[PDB]
Design a protein around this ligand. Sequence first.
Ligand SMILES: [Ca+2]
Length: 215
Amino acid sequence: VFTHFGEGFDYYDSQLWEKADGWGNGGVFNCIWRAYNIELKDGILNLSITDDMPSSSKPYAGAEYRTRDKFGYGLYQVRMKPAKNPGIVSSFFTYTGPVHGTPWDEIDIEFLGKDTTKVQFNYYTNSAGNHEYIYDLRFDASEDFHIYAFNWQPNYIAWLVDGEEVYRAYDDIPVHPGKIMLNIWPGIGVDEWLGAYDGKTNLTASYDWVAYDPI
Ligand SMILES: [Ca+2]
């Protein structure tokens, strides 16, 4: 049963959100997620990359903040300001995966820190990705908060920036409802895509609010 969802990041409510803590995604993600790199202050969600704890398997600690609940077709909106640095990604995306008994379906707004005048849109449907599209913003997303969105329908996904649609994709669209997830992370083995990360300290992607409306 999907219903309006609104989140202002005023307070952490463990029934609604989950601070990812003590696992990483592996592969190209060169960090473990730490609940301590999530901060809610003055109504802004701050997700940071820092140096990880001494006994971590990775050099860096990221943050990922994720809804308890899952969401279906409709309009997903974020008001956010990604981080700028080579070799990192600041994200708003939906995700479900084999662990939850479904195919890996996911829809992505990724800000490649190497160049925050661009956004990357992408989606995975039954694990099949390779739908990358880089949209030129003609502003620097790292300097101010802006509103990014996708409207996910059975037959397409539309992405939008500051209220206007800028890209639509038709091919093999995701099916299974997913959690909303926000993250920031440094990459490894992907110098071509992200640039090399340079260990620059205390990068923060900030998020003013998120909304979902079943339409
Ligand atoms: Ca807010």
